[PDB]
Design a protein around this ligand. Sequence first.
Ligand SMILES: CC(=O)NC[C@H]1CN(c2ccc(N3CCOCC3)c(F)c2)C(=O)O1
Ligand SMILES: [Cl-]
Ligand SMILES: [Cl-]
Ligand SMILES: [Cl-]
Ligand SMILES: [K+]
Ligand SMILES: [Mg+2]
Ligand SMILES: [Mg+2]
Ligand SMILES: [Mg+2]
Ligand SMILES: [Mg+2]
Ligand SMILES: [Mg+2]
Ligand SMILES: [Mg+2]
Ligand SMILES: [Mg+2]
Ligand SMILES: [Mg+2]
Ligand SMILES: [Mg+2]
Ligand SMILES: [Mg+2]
Ligand SMILES: [Mg+2]
Ligand SMILES: [Mg+2]
Ligand SMILES: [Mg+2]
Ligand SMILES: [Mg+2]
Ligand SMILES: [Mg+2]
Ligand SMILES: [Mg+2]
Ligand SMILES: [Mg+2]
Ligand SMILES: [Mg+2]
Ligand SMILES: [Mg+2]
Ligand SMILES: [Mg+2]
Ligand SMILES: [Mg+2]
Ligand SMILES: [Mg+2]
Ligand SMILES: [Mg+2]
Ligand SMILES: [Mg+2]
Ligand SMILES: [Mg+2]
Ligand SMILES: [Mg+2]
Ligand SMILES: [Mg+2]
Ligand SMILES: [Mg+2]
Ligand SMILES: [Mg+2]
Ligand SMILES: [Mg+2]
Ligand SMILES: [Mg+2]
Ligand SMILES: [Mg+2]
Ligand SMILES: [Mg+2]
Ligand SMILES: [Mg+2]
Ligand SMILES: [Mg+2]
Ligand SMILES: [Mg+2]
Ligand SMILES: [Mg+2]
Ligand SMILES: [Mg+2]
Ligand code: NA
Ligand code: NA
Ligand code: NA
Ligand code: NA
Ligand code: NA
Ligand code: NA
Ligand code: NA
Ligand code: NA
Ligand code: NA
Ligand code: NA
Ligand code: NA
Ligand code: NA
Ligand code: NA
Ligand code: NA
Ligand code: NA
Ligand code: NA
Ligand SMILES: [Sr+2]
Ligand SMILES: [Sr+2]
Ligand SMILES: [Sr+2]
Ligand SMILES: [Sr+2]
Ligand SMILES: [Sr+2]
Ligand SMILES: [Sr+2]
Ligand SMILES: [Sr+2]
Ligand SMILES: [Sr+2]
Ligand SMILES: [Sr+2]
Ligand SMILES: [Sr+2]
Ligand SMILES: [Sr+2]
Ligand SMILES: [Sr+2]
Ligand SMILES: [Sr+2]
Ligand SMILES: [Sr+2]
Ligand SMILES: [Sr+2]
Ligand SMILES: [Sr+2]
Ligand SMILES: [Sr+2]
Ligand SMILES: [Sr+2]
Ligand SMILES: [Sr+2]
Ligand SMILES: [Sr+2]
Ligand SMILES: [Sr+2]
Ligand SMILES: [Sr+2]
Ligand SMILES: [Sr+2]
Ligand SMILES: [Sr+2]
Ligand SMILES: [Sr+2]
Ligand SMILES: [Sr+2]
Ligand SMILES: [Sr+2]
Ligand SMILES: [Sr+2]
Ligand SMILES: [Sr+2]
Ligand SMILES: [Sr+2]
Ligand SMILES: [Sr+2]
Ligand SMILES: [Sr+2]
Ligand SMILES: [Sr+2]
Ligand SMILES: [Sr+2]
Ligand SMILES: [Sr+2]
Ligand SMILES: [Sr+2]
Ligand SMILES: [Sr+2]
Ligand SMILES: [Sr+2]
Ligand SMILES: [Sr+2]
Ligand SMILES: [Sr+2]
Ligand SMILES: [Sr+2]
Ligand SMILES: [Sr+2]
Ligand SMILES: [Sr+2]
Ligand SMILES: [Sr+2]
Ligand SMILES: [Sr+2]
Ligand SMILES: [Sr+2]
Ligand SMILES: [Sr+2]
Lengths: 56, 72, 237
Amino acid sequence: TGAGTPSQGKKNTTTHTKCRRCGEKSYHTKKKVCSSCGFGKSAKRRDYEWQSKAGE
Amino acid sequence: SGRFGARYGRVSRRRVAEIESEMNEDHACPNCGEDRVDRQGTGIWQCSYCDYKFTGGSYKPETPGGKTVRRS
Amino acid sequence: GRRIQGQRRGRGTSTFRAPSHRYKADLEHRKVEDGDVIAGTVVDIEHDPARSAPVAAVEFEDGDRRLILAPEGVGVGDELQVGVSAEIAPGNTLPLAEIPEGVPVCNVESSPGDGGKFARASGVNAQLLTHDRNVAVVKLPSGEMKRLDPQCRATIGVVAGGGRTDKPFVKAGNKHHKMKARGTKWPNVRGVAMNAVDHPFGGGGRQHPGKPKSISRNAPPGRKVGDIASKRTGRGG
RNA sequence: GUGGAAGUCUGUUAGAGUUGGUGUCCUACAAUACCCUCUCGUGAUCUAUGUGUAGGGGUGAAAGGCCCAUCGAGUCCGGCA
RNA sequence: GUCGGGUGAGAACCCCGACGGCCUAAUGGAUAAGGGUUCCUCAGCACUGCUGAUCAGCUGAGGGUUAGCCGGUCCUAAGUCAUACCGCAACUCGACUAUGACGAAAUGGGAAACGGGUUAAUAUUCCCGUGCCACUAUGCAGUGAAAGUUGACGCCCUGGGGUCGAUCACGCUGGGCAUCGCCCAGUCGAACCGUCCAACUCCGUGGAAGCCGUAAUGGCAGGAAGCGGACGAACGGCGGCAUAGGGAAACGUGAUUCAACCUGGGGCCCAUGAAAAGACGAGCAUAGUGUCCGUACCGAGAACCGACACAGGUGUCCAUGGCGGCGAAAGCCAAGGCCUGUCGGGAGCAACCAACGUUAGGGAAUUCGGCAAGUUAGUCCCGUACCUUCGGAAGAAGGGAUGCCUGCUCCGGAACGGAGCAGGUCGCAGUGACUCGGAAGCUCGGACUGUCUAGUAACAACAUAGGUGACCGCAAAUCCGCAAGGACUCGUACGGUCACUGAAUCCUGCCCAGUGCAGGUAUCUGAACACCUCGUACAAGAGGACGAAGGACCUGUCAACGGCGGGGGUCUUAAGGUAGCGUAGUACCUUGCCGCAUCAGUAGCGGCUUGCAUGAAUGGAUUAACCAGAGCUUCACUGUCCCAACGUUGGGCCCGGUGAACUGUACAUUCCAGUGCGGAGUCUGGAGACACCCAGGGGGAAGCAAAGACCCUAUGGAGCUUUACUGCAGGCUGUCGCUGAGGACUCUCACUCCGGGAGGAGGACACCGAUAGCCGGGCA
RNA sequence: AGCCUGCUUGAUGCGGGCAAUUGAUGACAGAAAAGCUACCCUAGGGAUAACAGAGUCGUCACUCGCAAGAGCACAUAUCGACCGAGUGGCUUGCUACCUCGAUGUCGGUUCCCUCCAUCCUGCCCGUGCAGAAGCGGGCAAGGGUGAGGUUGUUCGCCUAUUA
RNA sequence: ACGACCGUAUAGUACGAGAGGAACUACGGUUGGUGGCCACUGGUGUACCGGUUGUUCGAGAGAGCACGUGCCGGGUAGCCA
Ligand SMILES: CC(=O)NC[C@H]1CN(c2ccc(N3CCOCC3)c(F)c2)C(=O)O1
Ligand SMILES: [Cl-]
Ligand SMILES: [Cl-]
Ligand SMILES: [Cl-]
Ligand SMILES: [K+]
Ligand SMILES: [Mg+2]
Ligand SMILES: [Mg+2]
Ligand SMILES: [Mg+2]
Ligand SMILES: [Mg+2]
Ligand SMILES: [Mg+2]
Ligand SMILES: [Mg+2]
Ligand SMILES: [Mg+2]
Ligand SMILES: [Mg+2]
Ligand SMILES: [Mg+2]
Ligand SMILES: [Mg+2]
Ligand SMILES: [Mg+2]
Ligand SMILES: [Mg+2]
Ligand SMILES: [Mg+2]
Ligand SMILES: [Mg+2]
Ligand SMILES: [Mg+2]
Ligand SMILES: [Mg+2]
Ligand SMILES: [Mg+2]
Ligand SMILES: [Mg+2]
Ligand SMILES: [Mg+2]
Ligand SMILES: [Mg+2]
Ligand SMILES: [Mg+2]
Ligand SMILES: [Mg+2]
Ligand SMILES: [Mg+2]
Ligand SMILES: [Mg+2]
Ligand SMILES: [Mg+2]
Ligand SMILES: [Mg+2]
Ligand SMILES: [Mg+2]
Ligand SMILES: [Mg+2]
Ligand SMILES: [Mg+2]
Ligand SMILES: [Mg+2]
Ligand SMILES: [Mg+2]
Ligand SMILES: [Mg+2]
Ligand SMILES: [Mg+2]
Ligand SMILES: [Mg+2]
Ligand SMILES: [Mg+2]
Ligand SMILES: [Mg+2]
Ligand SMILES: [Mg+2]
Ligand SMILES: [Mg+2]
Ligand code: NA
Ligand code: NA
Ligand code: NA
Ligand code: NA
Ligand code: NA
Ligand code: NA
Ligand code: NA
Ligand code: NA
Ligand code: NA
Ligand code: NA
Ligand code: NA
Ligand code: NA
Ligand code: NA
Ligand code: NA
Ligand code: NA
Ligand code: NA
Ligand SMILES: [Sr+2]
Ligand SMILES: [Sr+2]
Ligand SMILES: [Sr+2]
Ligand SMILES: [Sr+2]
Ligand SMILES: [Sr+2]
Ligand SMILES: [Sr+2]
Ligand SMILES: [Sr+2]
Ligand SMILES: [Sr+2]
Ligand SMILES: [Sr+2]
Ligand SMILES: [Sr+2]
Ligand SMILES: [Sr+2]
Ligand SMILES: [Sr+2]
Ligand SMILES: [Sr+2]
Ligand SMILES: [Sr+2]
Ligand SMILES: [Sr+2]
Ligand SMILES: [Sr+2]
Ligand SMILES: [Sr+2]
Ligand SMILES: [Sr+2]
Ligand SMILES: [Sr+2]
Ligand SMILES: [Sr+2]
Ligand SMILES: [Sr+2]
Ligand SMILES: [Sr+2]
Ligand SMILES: [Sr+2]
Ligand SMILES: [Sr+2]
Ligand SMILES: [Sr+2]
Ligand SMILES: [Sr+2]
Ligand SMILES: [Sr+2]
Ligand SMILES: [Sr+2]
Ligand SMILES: [Sr+2]
Ligand SMILES: [Sr+2]
Ligand SMILES: [Sr+2]
Ligand SMILES: [Sr+2]
Ligand SMILES: [Sr+2]
Ligand SMILES: [Sr+2]
Ligand SMILES: [Sr+2]
Ligand SMILES: [Sr+2]
Ligand SMILES: [Sr+2]
Ligand SMILES: [Sr+2]
Ligand SMILES: [Sr+2]
Ligand SMILES: [Sr+2]
Ligand SMILES: [Sr+2]
Ligand SMILES: [Sr+2]
Ligand SMILES: [Sr+2]
Ligand SMILES: [Sr+2]
Ligand SMILES: [Sr+2]
Ligand SMILES: [Sr+2]
Ligand SMILES: [Sr+2]
């Protein structure tokens, strides 16, 4: 079975959903962790310096 | 070992035969003396006559070493 | 390279773990205040998923219902005893001191009260040889002369299920089912059959180990494979 | 005669797979498809959902296979002009 | 699809009828995920729709999803998280141990609902009728009440009970057909309340020494059959429910085979087939409460994922509709659905292409190769070789039969079940279509089933049972983590870890020199701390003494890495190739030589064999069975071929509509020669050449597609190896700290382990922190 | 061998320096340094190889000159060494001129044109030409040159047909 | 747009001891190639006519479906070798 089109048919699982804290559709309902703001993982807000150019 | 057809070879199924042959013989119950003991699973035997359920070998109700304990 | 299989094991992932949630009981000698008065009745015989051997259910006088490492010859109804003054019959537990020399013993403790460590597998048995006020010499199933505290409890008789090893598996499917009841990854791919990146014996136009197989005791994990610190090899001499 | 064992046999039962045609297609119906043939089909079987293992790490009946069209070291952004 | 008709400005494709078709495990019915309004109505056609459109999953505007008894909700599963504790420089990081919570919507467990009616769209939710459950209140009863039972369970075979469905018989109601007398539909009616009870188990009676019983196993003086009794089943029977409901009407009765559902018997395990909440146990009347969330629609060749209205992918139940037949097979047909696997019109409709039918004679001559196609075929009877692990080989092979009609026999309770007989009779053909093996032999490989390169490799590769070696007594061996800690392990040598070989059978020789591992070791070598000497008012530093692991040295070990030659009638370097097998999937010479077979055989098989360069678990030899594995031969068969022809369907060609992409320095009607960076439509010389268009097969444009992947170059990259360079983990070992009392020794008080505790074992060791020497492609 | 100098200062220790000799880098105008990749990746090169083209022509094919020699005698019916002179561009080698932002392999097949150094057919000459069948040579490219067994083979070996 | 071969008569002759064994010329045929044609033979012929299996239309009659003929037998025109 091909990894392409034929294997896309089996995709009906829900994972990432609207997040209670930030509003983004990034709350992984299986992990109960938001990949965008860190809700479920951190009291602090997910943030990284690499999300921008080093001198900005 | 006839269920094994022409597969596996002599020894493997020759032993399965002797082993299962001695395994299914009617065994003399330790409780009463009737030859009515049948295996219920691995190392588990039971008498259909008096219902005495007991432990023994995996394929025989008594093993050489088992019979030794009695002596000493 | 990549971590060899022996190193994946250690991480304790599902594939290498034992089906514990499926295991029955931790067959340990009961704890008796003292006196030995403790006795019970064998209520049933069962299959132990973890040892492929039968195990006996016992109802003790004081109400306790516990599974027991059953020796050969124990049947429903029989009465078992645990204590310093327990009779000397198969299926009974007492310290190596109270046991007469020359008697087959099983489920021997390593240190008084641990609950039993030695001789617990199918049809095996320890042999109580010498006594003393300080040391109890027991011959273990491996043939080794072990020196134990005479206070170490044990059960009289050999373990049930003897001869299990006598019958061949005949087919891969039979191994398969047993393995699925143990903490073991099976089947096994030979080291020499893998790529050089996956094992010290991997690689080569044809299959053969790269170096000699006898590895040193000091080799690090990932390299300690083949014949570990072999004192010798082969059958010759 | 009874019995009905088997990683047993036949089988497009369901279901799983894919030997050959080096057929059709090859700005495709399709970034792995179509048809016929062919193999497996009570078992180391097939399958749904849930769950676990995470990047020099997993997972691997071992093909350097697989880890979201990506693998002799994933992906994203940063180092970086 | 076609003919009529309807609507409309407009109709091949929007709707009605008729006629003709398509789908039957699906193209029908109900749903899970996922989508999210796609659902219903009205009004529309700029957008979307493979053409058109009055249509629509499109546009605009409105409307639609109603629950004590269907899910959620509650329980716990693998497992997840939070808090506490501990670690970490630290944390949003990390393992254990506690507590708590979380974790199952078809498809785990679970208190209780059925029938009908109704809407454009909901419906076990609304309405009508009837029923049920839980909690609480009141009242009567009750002192019982928690032991136990249930929830609650694997795989294979099978008996019995039994409903729906289907079928058979006869009656009634309605329809169809119109030479007969046939053919189709219906003949209804729930939950619930009550009642009945086979099997299993047990009791009394009884008294079998051979009887009782089964599909089979089996049962009994430790008490069989028989008899009587206790307990005891269905989603089943029976009565109510029901002068409820439903039907135009009749509004049946029996039977067989019996899905569901109930209940038993047998067999298997080196495999043992959840848990918890809850229920029962534990009465009845009346009343009150039963909130919260989900509920439309699609569920796919247009509502999901794949950029699409995508020939792909995508779970569950309907597995009992009729004929057929072994059948959930084919083929045909109902119920139900559809003509939307959605562009049409025209040409006897050419060439050419895709699928396909038929081909005389020859019959594999074709080709690397029988690739492709074909041949055979279902069932019964007869019959069946070598070889073999005695299972198999085997459906070996080979031979014969096969329909219909009339009247019968046998088995069985019977079937609308099966096995046969006699007579009659039709065809070229009776498994008449459909369904449906071609067969045989030799050789190689792997024992077998099984695994694999999702997307060019299915194999001889991986696995496997079997064989073997290695480590370890559990405070272990092996492995993960920086640590706190952890896997193995609810495990304990009949264990499990680390490796090799790869079923069975006959076997498995010689070598320990090198390398590896391990043991030993007088002597030699061997670091740091402390110590001693010199040096320095101290220190740097130089030297000495002592000496751990390790090494030198000795030994053990090849089913440990590996080796088993040249020369002569020993030498390198330990031994010098044994049983076997051999021109090998290993043999360069090579198409080796001889033979078989063919008209002819670099093939194949048998023999020989000096083997360029076979050989014993780097396993050797051999081998029944198995195989989409490699090679060879035979019989049969055939358009593979001789050598091609005719035909069928869809395209192609013409017409309406829709309508891209690839590619393009420029010029360009070329051809022959030559020349040129030596491979020119364009330069030179000649020749030829009126322009444009249609169809064609592809000679050229060193055609188009991809900054060649081959080769080389770069003080390029990466993966991999090792006795390359340099380092880093880890293991061993000494030393210092923890650390105490009296080159060998005792003790107990720290510290460690075992124990519920008392206490026991060990003990200044071990663990841990620091450092030193050795090993160290495990890693950079 | 002598001298200069070391952080407030003196002494001592132990350092730092001026001049020069000796110790090695042999890849010798001096890095401390092993391999595999067909799992491969990038930059580029026709600056450099493999196909093919092109040049060459030793090799290869064919020819000619001379003609020793033998051919029972007789060089020249026929065979024909040595040595010498050439033609071709089918083999092979050499070169690196063309192409690495791509000129797809061998063999086969199918279909078309051509060359002659002619295998057959037509016409001839000689003969060690009686005839018949041959052997050798000349003109000549109109037509023909087929089917099969092993092997992927080209080649070649083999079979039966054939002008 | 024709190439080539075999055979008969010549002739058992010329030649030659014999064995063996021609030619000119005239004829008949075969093969390869070429162009055309279908009375003859052969193929096709899903025009057509018949037989017959399963199933559906109640039987009969007459039909549909079974891949573009269910299968089998015969086959006109045309096209062909
Ligand atoms: C496709 C491609 O690379 N195209 C570019 C060039 C190179 N080439 C070529 C070179 C060697 C070989 N081979 C032939 C066989 O021996 C090995 C080299 C070749 F076939 C073909 C060619 O024609 O054009
Ligand atoms: Cl095992
Ligand atoms: Cl629901
Ligand atoms: Cl029964
Ligand atoms: K090139
Ligand atoms: Mg235990
Ligand atoms: Mg497991
Ligand atoms: Mg293995
Ligand atoms: Mg490999
Ligand atoms: Mg490695
Ligand atoms: Mg091997
Ligand atoms: Mg090997
Ligand atoms: Mg899963
Ligand atoms: Mg490889
Ligand atoms: Mg409308
Ligand atoms: Mg509805
Ligand atoms: Mg569509
Ligand atoms: Mg023919
Ligand atoms: Mg041929
Ligand atoms: Mg074939
Ligand atoms: Mg009868
Ligand atoms: Mg061979
Ligand atoms: Mg195999
Ligand atoms: Mg592949
Ligand atoms: Mg295969
Ligand atoms: Mg193998
Ligand atoms: Mg074993
Ligand atoms: Mg093994
Ligand atoms: Mg083993
Ligand atoms: Mg040979
Ligand atoms: Mg080209
Ligand atoms: Mg490039
Ligand atoms: Mg390369
Ligand atoms: Mg590199
Ligand atoms: Mg502890
Ligand atoms: Mg490295
Ligand atoms: Mg010096
Ligand atoms: Mg230099
Ligand atoms: Mg110089
Ligand atoms: Mg490159
Ligand atoms: Mg060049
Ligand atoms: Mg000439
Ligand atoms: Mg010519
Ligand atoms: Na029998
Ligand atoms: Na296929
Ligand atoms: Na990585
Ligand atoms: Na349409
Ligand atoms: Na009832
Ligand atoms: Na049927
Ligand atoms: Na199988
Ligand atoms: Na050695
Ligand atoms: Na060897
Ligand atoms: Na297979
Ligand atoms: Na054909
Ligand atoms: Na062209
Ligand atoms: Na790499
Ligand atoms: Na020349
Ligand atoms: Na010619
Ligand atoms: Na040939
Ligand atoms: Sr899915
Ligand atoms: Sr968290
Ligand atoms: Sr931050
Ligand atoms: Sr324990
Ligand atoms: Sr314990
Ligand atoms: Sr190797
Ligand atoms: Sr030996
Ligand atoms: Sr099978
Ligand atoms: Sr099958
Ligand atoms: Sr292929
Ligand atoms: Sr085909
Ligand atoms: Sr393709
Ligand atoms: Sr079956
Ligand atoms: Sr960047
Ligand atoms: Sr319009
Ligand atoms: Sr609609
Ligand atoms: Sr919950
Ligand atoms: Sr449920
Ligand atoms: Sr099942
Ligand atoms: Sr029944
Ligand atoms: Sr609904
Ligand atoms: Sr549906
Ligand atoms: Sr579909
Ligand atoms: Sr597919
Ligand atoms: Sr219908
Ligand atoms: Sr349309
Ligand atoms: Sr015909
Ligand atoms: Sr052939
Ligand atoms: Sr051939
Ligand atoms: Sr036959
Ligand atoms: Sr696969
Ligand atoms: Sr063997
Ligand atoms: Sr050695
Ligand atoms: Sr020999
Ligand atoms: Sr073998
Ligand atoms: Sr064309
Ligand atoms: Sr080397
Ligand atoms: Sr390779
Ligand atoms: Sr070269
Ligand atoms: Sr000429
Ligand atoms: Sr001639
Ligand atoms: Sr060639
Ligand atoms: Sr050759
Ligand atoms: Sr003649
Ligand atoms: Sr004569
Ligand atoms: Sr038809
Ligand atoms: Sr047939």
